[PDB]
Amino acid sequence: DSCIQFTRHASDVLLNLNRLRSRDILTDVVIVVSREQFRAHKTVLMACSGLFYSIFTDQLKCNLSVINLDPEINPEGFCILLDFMYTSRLNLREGNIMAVMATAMYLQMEHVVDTCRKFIKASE
Amino acid sequence: DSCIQFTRHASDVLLNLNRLRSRDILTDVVIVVSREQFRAHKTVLMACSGLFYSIFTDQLKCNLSVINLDPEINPEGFCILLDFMYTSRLNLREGNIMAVMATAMYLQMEHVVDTCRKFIKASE
């Protein structure tokens, strides 16, 4: 087509979606990771994760307001990945990289799994 | 912080949100613009438009599944702006610029109003 494109649009949309999350505006699901609860927007979770895409396209699961993750999932790892979904920034540290990578494999977030593998290889 | 950032994340999120819209997945509102109907995600509309942000933060309107726009709004202008919200690309043409600018003023989409004003000034 002959469209023009606003470079910062996608980043500005994501910043506003994170502001809605902060303010608990139109959040429509609670993700439970053992004793912790995280509120989010189903559409953002599906846009970032192959696991959430599969969950919320299922005719029965699409209607659930609570999703319980596998008990082996680390809540801090999940929190770091949820923040990445809404900001593009990943708080990857020596003390959390194994939990973050394991969580990203489970959630099916291939670009995160890729940077974790590279950071681990560099330390070996 | 000491975060790393994935450059293409926000663009990839927006592309996936547009794929959900295409496929009518988790759309939760119908916007009526006279005889036409447009399905969308409330969160994407709020993230892009000051008018939708005000509508869906209202304690009564947040619960509506149908929103009727002012009868003066042009459906093609709205369609072009809805496509911009989900893609960052604006199909601005000599034959539609006046309707697009009027719609962007109503929806409170300041960056679009800005490029329309500039394109109009260039033709004068």
Binding site: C3, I4, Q5, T7 | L90, H111, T115
Partner: peptide, 4 residues
């Protein structure tokens, strides 16, 4: 704004 740019030409994509």
């Amino acid at each position: 704004w740019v030409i994509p």
